[PDB]
Design a protein around this ligand. Structure first.
Ligand SMILES: [Zn+2]
Lengths: 304, 75
């Protein structure tokens, strides 16, 4: 049986366990960590992170294996992220703590010939004044995940990841911005595109909105996603290089805003096309049909 | 200066800020037009979640920068 180890939940820590199952299911990320931590054989977050992911990226070595990942939380609690060890947290916030710690760790490392971690991408922002049609220059900012707003849902109208992506990329009217031509303010047209695509693509579907009344709203709507994802339509340049991605893992959030539980669907490791449902310490075989029917929250794609 | 905040629906609002302003000051300004309490806000720039306490100078947020606003979904 090709089952991975489970992770014990020592106090509402499923937000960490679900992220780790997803990250260990991204082989390019683990290969980068091995390359990055190889310089230390010439403490640190990357060494603690790789120890867990290397174990979770392979089939269990004993029947019903269960590991404990709170050594990772201890070091983050000490140096990067001040939280309790028992309160519920957001797996996407943790993803950005980990990703920020690794970029900070690399900035202080001595082998600068090595590449940035594979989740790191760059987005473009183009802007033009509607009054004088003077295009401002291009602005590139980095990103470690795409946080997509979930549009309004209609009965009988499918809600697809492609729709969420196009809405993130669509142009918009931005009122009351100063112009350098009209000296002024005025209304601008703004659009975000994708300049550099990451080898590992993390998609964050925002399941929290703000209500008209003034309180958060959990977004229960099912967002259709595919095992294969083509990102060509969202590139800034007319790059003739194709950008095809494959689904590696899904992090799913069950429950409301205050309370909730994180779960992860991931591929089985080859020692392939078999899927697993991982809920903390419990690992079960799952079909791809169950995976595609889940309410995705974090989607991990890897470029092929 | 003048910066942009990508809000929860994808719409991008414009804010008037100074490089010396803290982001709790900026979260206060997002509350003014969006009604989100600052403690419920997560502001992300350059892949970094912005830590209340620092200013926009430490993160090197310059004019016409685009911050991204997301909520905190605990589990
Ligand atoms: Zn103008």
């Amino acid at each position: 049986k090709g089952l991975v180890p489970g992770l014990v939940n020592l106090g509402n820590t499923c937000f960490m366990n679900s992220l780790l199952q997803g990250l260990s299911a991204c082989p390019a990320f683990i290969r980068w960590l091995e390359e990055f931590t190889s310089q230390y054989s010439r403490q640190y977050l990357s060494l603690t992170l790789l120890h867990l992911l290397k174990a979770l990226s392979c089939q269990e070595v004993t029947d019903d294996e269960v590991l404990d990942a709170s050594c990772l939380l201890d070091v983050l609690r000490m140096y990067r992220w001040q939280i309790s060890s028992f309160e519920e947290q957001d797996a996407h916030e943790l993803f950005h703590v980990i990703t920020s710690s690794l970029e900070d760790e690399r900035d202080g490392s001595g082998s600068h010939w090595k590449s940035q971690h594979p989740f790191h991408g760059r987005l473009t922002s183009n802007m033009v004044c509607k009054h004088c049609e003077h295009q401002s220059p291009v602005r590139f900012d980095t990103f470690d995940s795409l946080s997509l707003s979930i549009p309004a849902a209609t009965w009988g109208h499918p809600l697809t990841l492609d729709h969420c992506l196009h809405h993130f990329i669509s142009s918009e009217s931005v009122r009351d911005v100063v112009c350098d031509n009209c000296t002024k303010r005025t209304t601008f047209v703004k659009q975000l595109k994708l300049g550099k695509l990451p080898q590992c693509l993390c998609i964050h579907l925002q399941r929290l909105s703000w209500s008209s009344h003034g309180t958060p709203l959990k977004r229960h709507e099912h967002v259709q996603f595919n095992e294969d994802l083509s990102m060509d339509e969202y590139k800034y340049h007319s790059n003739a290089s194709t950008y095809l991605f494959r689904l590696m893992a899904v992090v799913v959030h069950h429950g409301d805003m205050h309370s909730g539980h994180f779960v992860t669907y991931r591929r089985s490791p080859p020692s392939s096309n078999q899927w697993l449902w991982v809920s903390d310490d419990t690992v079960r075989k799952a079909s791809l049909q169950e995976v595609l029917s889940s309410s995705a929250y974090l989607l991990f794609y890897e470029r092929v | 200066m003048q910066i942009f905040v990508k809000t929860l629906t994808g719409k991008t609002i414009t804010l008037e800020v100074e490089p010396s302003d803290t982001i709790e000051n900026v979260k206060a300004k997002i509350q003014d037009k969006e009604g989100i309490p600052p403690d419920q806000q997560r502001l992300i720039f350059a892949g970094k979640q912005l830590e209340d306490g620092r200013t926009l100078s430490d993160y090197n947020i310059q004019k016409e920068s685009t911050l991204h606003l997301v909520l905190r979904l605990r589990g």
